[PDB]
Each structure stands twice: as C-alpha cells, then as structure tokens.
Design a protein around this ligand. Sequence first.
Ligand SMILES: Nc1ncnc2c1ncn2[C@@H]1O[C@H](COP(=O)(O)OP(=O)(O)O)[C@@H](O)[C@H]1O
Ligand SMILES: Nc1ncnc2c1ncn2[C@@H]1O[C@H](COP(=O)(O)OP(=O)(O)O)[C@@H](O)[C@H]1O
Length: 214
Amino acid sequence: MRIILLGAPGAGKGTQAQFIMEKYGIPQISTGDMLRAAVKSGSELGKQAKDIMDAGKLVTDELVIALVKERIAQEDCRNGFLLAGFPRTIPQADAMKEAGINVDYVLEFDVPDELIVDRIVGRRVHAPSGRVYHVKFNPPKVEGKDDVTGEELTTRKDDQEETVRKRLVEYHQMTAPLIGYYSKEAEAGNTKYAKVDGTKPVAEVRADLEKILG
Ligand SMILES: Nc1ncnc2c1ncn2[C@@H]1O[C@H](COP(=O)(O)OP(=O)(O)O)[C@@H](O)[C@H]1O
Ligand SMILES: Nc1ncnc2c1ncn2[C@@H]1O[C@H](COP(=O)(O)OP(=O)(O)O)[C@@H](O)[C@H]1O
C-alpha cells in the first residue's frame, strides 16, 4: 500500500501517518523529518536546508526529490510507504510520475486556515522518531515526554507563528494545486482519492482513515 497525505501545514498529517505506519506496517516518509535530521547530523544531502526552513520557505525540488529517491529505494519500502510533506510542488509530483511511483490512496485533510497557528505553536516532537504531540489538543501521557521512549520532547525551530504564516502562504501558492493534481489522477483510475475532515478529534480522524484503508 502506497499513500500520499495532502493538506496544509498543521492539518494533522504527521499525527495520522504514525497510526497508519503502526497498523499497516509501512514506513512514513516525511521530508520535513528527513531534512531536520540532515541538518542535525550535518549530512551532505540536506544540511543545506537549515536557513530555508528557518525562513518558512520551501527547499529546492531537486534536494527533496533526491532525499525521497534515496529513502524509498530502501528495503523497508518494498511493500509500500506513506508520503507526508512530499510531494509539495507540481514538479515534485511530476518527478514521481516520471519515475513510475504510483500510489494507491491520496488522502486530503480539510482544515480551516484559522486553526493552523494554534496547532503549530503547541506542537512538540520526538526528534529521533518523528512522533508529534500537542500540549493542549493531543498531549503525551507525561508532560514533555515521548510516549514510546519517555525521552524529552522538543519544539521545532520553525514552529513560531510568523514562520507558520509564511509556510501557509507557500502552501497556498505552491502546494494546494496538488489537490487538483491527484483528483485528476484519481479520475483517470491511477489512485483512489478521499477527503477527510481534519478538525475532528485525533481519534476520530484515525477511525475515519481506518474505514478508508481497511
Ligand atoms: N485532529 C486534530 N485536532 C487537534 N490537533 C491536532 C489534530 N491532529 C494533529 N493535531 C496537532 O496539531 C499539530 C499539527 O499536527 P501535525 O500532525 O504535526 O500536522 P502536519 O504534519 O500536517 O503539519 C500537532 O501539534 C498535532 O499534535
Ligand atoms: N517536499 C518538500 N519540498 C520542499 N520543502 C520541504 C518539503 N518537505 C519539507 N520541506 C521543508 O521543511 C519545512 C517543514 O516542513 P514539514 O516538516 O512538512 O512541516 P509542516 O508539516 O508544518 O508543513 C518546510 O517549511 C520546508 O522548508
């Protein structure tokens, strides 16, 4: 099973990707996580992203295409994968198509813009794994601690209100056109498309996704 999650920053993609990876046994491919990890480790492929993410802007297509190509070639993707945060531009989607990377489901998270800032300013992450929490809306069992390892959560350097508003502008200009892109692909029979109400509680969105995926 191959899945793309579409939606604005803060729509809930990383949150729901974790459940899907747990239940269906396919890896989550998050370009944001991969880029942040490359910066942290000083990896030659991706360390360049530091100042760009800080500015709320998109990394170059060629950098994230290279990262994703490297990642999905790995054996743990042989049976499928989930993309969360990629593709982010029409050229990134076309690069997938040209490489023959078809997907089974495209799942769009519908969330009002007005909810995004308060979601992202409360976001806390377990950097080693990517797991995501919210201090008020989806808290860990123990404050400031990852549920799975118990390790300290952190706040992403780019999760400030003003940076979020810049990311939302980028989303509307560059990334929202992928909704139509994959709607058209679904009409051709190349994927299944579904839209979900991302304002429901985390557990209910999860249940809604399980209905679709099986
Ligand atoms: N259904 C929801 N209701 C309220 N908050 C949510 C919901 N889903 C996720 N969140 C929280 O909002 C923030 C954004 O979710 P996240 O999954 O990181 O979004 P994305 O990966 O789409 O940017 C996180 O702090 C997360 O805990
Ligand atoms: N596919 C991508 N193309 C370009 N830039 C990306 C991509 N994925 C992540 N980024 C960069 O990483 C930043 C954080 O993205 P991400 O972790 O997906 O956060 P959010 O879920 O809040 O959108 C983006 O603002 C951008 O700089």
